[PDB]
A = this chain, B = another copy of it.
Amino acid sequence: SVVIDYNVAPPNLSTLPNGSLFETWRPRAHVLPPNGQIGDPCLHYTDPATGLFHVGFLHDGSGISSATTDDLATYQDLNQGNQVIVPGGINDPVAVFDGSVIPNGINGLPTLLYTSVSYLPIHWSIPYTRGSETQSLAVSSDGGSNFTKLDQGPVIPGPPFAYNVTAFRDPYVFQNPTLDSLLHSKNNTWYTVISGGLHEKGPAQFLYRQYDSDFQYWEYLGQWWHEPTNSTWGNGTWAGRWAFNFETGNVFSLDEYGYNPHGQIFTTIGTEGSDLPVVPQLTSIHDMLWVSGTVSRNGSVSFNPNMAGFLDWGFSSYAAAGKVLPSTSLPSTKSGAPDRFISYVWLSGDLFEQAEGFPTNQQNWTGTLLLPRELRVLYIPNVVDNALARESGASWQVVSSDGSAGTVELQTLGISIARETKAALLSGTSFTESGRTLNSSGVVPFKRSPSEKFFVLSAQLSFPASARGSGLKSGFQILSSEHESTTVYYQFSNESIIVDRSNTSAAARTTDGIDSSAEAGKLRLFDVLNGGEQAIETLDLTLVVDNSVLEVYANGRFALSTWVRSWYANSTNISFFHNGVGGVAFSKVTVSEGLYDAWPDRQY
């Protein structure tokens, strides 16, 4: 069968045999199935009996598949990658959508509450078919390889009486003593949020609590959070739009270290956006947002947002699912971590099924999850109390102020690679490129580049005072050779990290459905006071390249992830990049090469 040589120019990839491009763009350090398509992650839980962390995801549009980890770095497939629960039962004859797990449930077994689907199609833009989405229970008695459906109807057969929902799915089970105290619930009551919205009103999270010890009945507590149709946090700059429908709602509570039941309450959601006029059955904008809020009561409970942002700025990033990972788990016991909230963002492989022409049968897989991320409250001290710091409707807020110093402490969402995964990514070969200051325009090669498309690059960029309000662009050119290059840079004129993919892939010239549009995410660098002098915040950059999967992290509070589908074997060189407009000081750049095998017990 056919010979592949990545030093030779590519054909139209649609002409190659099935499976011939299996390895071409495939990551080694990310969660994705053995083959085929990955959809929304869900079902994650820690098994209290074994300590193993279980992860799950929709697989091939035909149910939920799953894997375990004892270290939060590497994974073991359950049921050989085949689905632990499939459609075709009485409650879910057409489909299985997201569900979440009560780890210590019916008979002390993991108990899945999930969206069972009986009628398609389903979309916020069209009229809703009554009973199309219900919430049903299943239980695993075999260690999470098979979830057996209860032989009864759904436990939540529909939305509240006469509600004209846009959607009613993705039930997310969670505990919270702040809710308990506000609602006089029994201690350690399980809550469920269901995500969707209302036609002619707008997106919403529907809130419930268990009524009975049996998980059979769920008492409706109201739309604890809802926003008008296509409205937006602030003026729309820092947290996209609330848009036409909420999906994949997660609810959890954080402090400075990780997860805390008494901590500040957060939610992550997908929003489904669109231009006007609306194109039937099309969601053109898939925003992956996080939201901080205060929960109060005046009859019924409300979640009132006080700041919001993106969990990942990638066009193709969406549908994140996360779970409490307790300190007692196997991974946390090995690493000494406190209680955490670990979230896996989904990276759709085909633009949410809008990449017609992509050589899908050649690759024989579609999509990945991003690296597990730890979520925590992040504080930014010694920020200069000016208009940059004080902007309303943004992704941070002032929590204290020092009139004498002229400073504020800021608060925002901390987003970083989970620690055991980060350390396993840095495990191999390790070299440093010298710091330097650049004033003129162009790319300057590193003295040494990684020899393969599997690396981490870490660097600090320091900008001088004149950078503010200039047309400066500075960063790195990666995955470069004669025929290809990808540029990642910060741009002050629109306060953004940009990924320029115009030259990323030689395959995009010969083949349809290989996207080359720019990716972008907003990032403000504040003014800070250190050693008694005022300066622009250091841009602390971490780039993880995993064959075709690029994740760009910054300052412990920013992520932008995308596909970088470079063809040529030589497209591995790294250079400094600066457009010449002002100057920039690069610290020493660390490069770690090779990453690690996240699936050590797989063949491929």
Interface residues of A (CB under 8 A from B): 90-91, 93, 118-119, 129-132, 134, 151-155, 157-158, 161-162, 211-212, 216-217, 219
Contacts and interface: CB of A to CB of B under 8 A. Distances in A.
A249 B520 CA distance: 65
B211 A162 contact: yes
A153 to B, nearest CB: 2
B162 A158 contact: no
Nearest to A218: B161
Contacts of A132: 152-153
A211 B160 CA distance: 14
Given A90-B118, A119-B152, A119-B153, A161 B129 contact: no
A559 B268 CA distance: 68
Contacts of A217: 161-162
A130 to B, nearest CB: 4
Contact of A90 (B93, B162, B211, B212): B93
Q: Interface centre among A130, A161, A212, by most B CB within 10 Å?
A: A130
Given A157-B158, A162-B212, A131 B152 contact: yes
A249 B89 CA distance: 32
Nearest to A155: B130
30 contacts: A90-B93, A90-B118, A90-B119, A91-B118, A91-B131, A93-B93, A118-B153, A119-B151, A119-B152, A129-B151, A129-B152, A129-B153, A130-B152, A130-B153, A130-B155, A130-B216, A131-B152, A131-B154, A131-B157, A132-B152, A132-B153, A134-B153, A134-B157, A153-B158, A157-B157, A161-B211, A161-B217, A161-B219, A162-B211, A162-B217
A137 B95 CA distance: 23
A130 B137 CA distance: 12
Contacts of A219: 161
Nearest to A118: B90
Contacts of A152: 119, 129-132
A152 B131 CA distance: 6
A154 B134 CA distance: 12
Contacts of A134: 153, 157
Contacts of A93: 90, 93
A135 to B, nearest CB: 12
Nearest to A211: B162
Q: Interface centre among A132, A157, A161, A212, by most B CB within 10 Å?
A: A157
Contacts of A162: 211-212, 217
Q: Interface centre among A118, A131, A211, A216, by most B CB within 10 Å?
A: A131
Given A131-B152, A132-B153, A134-B153, 20 more contacts: A90-B119, A91-B118, A91-B131, A93-B93, A118-B153, A119-B152, A129-B151, A129-B152, A129-B153, A130-B152, A130-B153, A130-B154, A130-B155, A131-B157, A132-B152, A153-B158, A161-B211, A161-B217, A162-B211, A162-B212
Nearest to A90: B118
A136 to B, nearest CB: 9
A147 B91 CA distance: 23
A217 B212 CA distance: 27
Nearest to A152: B130
Nearest to A219: B161
Nearest to A153: B131
Contacts of A153: 118-119, 129-132, 134, 158
A557 to B, nearest CB: 43
Contacts of A212: 162
A164 to B, nearest CB: 10
Contacts of A154: 130-131
A155 B161 CA distance: 11
A132 to B, nearest CB: 7
Nearest to A216: B130
Contacts of A91: 118, 131
Contacts of A129: 151-153
Contacts of A155: 130
Contacts of A119: 90, 151-153
A131 B118 CA distance: 14
Contacts of A157: 131, 134, 157-158
A292 B161 CA distance: 32
Nearest to A162: B217
A86 B129 CA distance: 22
A161 B155 CA distance: 11
A584 to B, nearest CB: 60
A120 to B, nearest CB: 11
Nearest to A132: B153
A157 B116 CA distance: 14
A64 B216 CA distance: 33
Contacts of A131: 91, 152-154, 157
A126 to B, nearest CB: 13
